[PDB]
Ligand binder design. Structure first.
Ligand code: CA
Ligand code: CA
Ligand code: CA
Ligand code: CA
Ligand code: CA
Lengths: 170, 176
């Protein structure tokens, strides 16, 4: 399934997000046109999987901001689940404040469009997508639920696509 | 496109390959069951682009072998084209001797099944795939042509999957 293809416009969408300041907002993918985007899905809120991945990405938000790349996280949980999890401090098992928006895909349409829905669980796989400043998909990464992604590898990829966009290697 | 899905058997195939020793052989994907496989595609033999990425995976072949993992490369070029490229010295643009088999996908079915075929060019994207020792597909990576992959990242992933197969997910006590 999915319309997500390398070299073609990433699937657009409008969805509820908890913004870093804790406020609900309607977020459109096409609103980030003019900057690279790291769009990564996680399965569920709370502790279905370890929250070290989502945290590592929030803490590197500034490494991505420095090279003009926005980072956005998404799951099928409600925007109300996201906020309850953010408003639970880290010292009591919660996420605490985040430096990236969390997107809600309760209709499962975004997961479906990006080819990352695990159909039997109704849950996204650990998908990560790199989208360029014109809205084109440059990179697809999907992992089975037990293994997390690498901030440092994602950073290598974004700088390498940015670099080759303005040069052309040898 | 494709039948490659996380949690399903990696799509099987039989194809001509140039083995490390220089001999042609009919290589079948399901023959690698009992071990992990890193299966990666590159676009084309003999480009002007340096084959750094392909050489780097060749030289890490041993590192993968030690942890119970085989590394296989593929493009839509013929095995005759692969052989010509290995027998071209690195100094004059060639590949030199290789420590991993180069699979030939002249029918483009493998590329199609793994969903990495760039239609307008008729070549593969830089897709890379991690298949477990039961032939189940664990990880999908697809880069646009300008950006290569990382041996080190591929090692982290292979080891990470092997570890979770035995122990389950790494999580700190409490719920991180
Ligand atoms: Ca669901
Ligand atoms: Ca984890
Ligand atoms: Ca021969
Ligand atoms: Ca093994
Ligand atoms: Ca073939």
């Amino acid at each position: 399934a999915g319309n997500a293809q390398i070299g073609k416009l990433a699937p657009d969408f409008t969805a509820k997000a908890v913004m870093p300041d804790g406020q609900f907002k309607d977020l459109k993918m096409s609103d980030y046109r003019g900057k690279y985007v790291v769009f990564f899905f996680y399965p569920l809120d709370f502790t279905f999987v370890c929250p070290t991945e989502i945290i590592a990405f929030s803490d590197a938000a500034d490494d991505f901001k420095k090279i003009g790349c926005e980072v956005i996280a998404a799951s099928v949980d409600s925007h109300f689940s996201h906020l309850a999890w953010i408003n639970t401090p880290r010292k009591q098992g919660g996420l605490g404040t985040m430096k990236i928006p969390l997107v809600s895909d309760t209709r499962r349409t975004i997961s479906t469009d990006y080819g990352v829905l695990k159909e039997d669980d109704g849950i996204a796989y650990r998908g990560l997508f790199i989208i360029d400043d014109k809205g084109i998909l440059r990179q697809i990464t999907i992992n089975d639920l037990p293994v997390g992604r690498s901030v440092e590898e994602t950073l290598r990829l974004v700088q390498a696509f940015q670099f080759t966009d303005k040069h052309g290697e040898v």
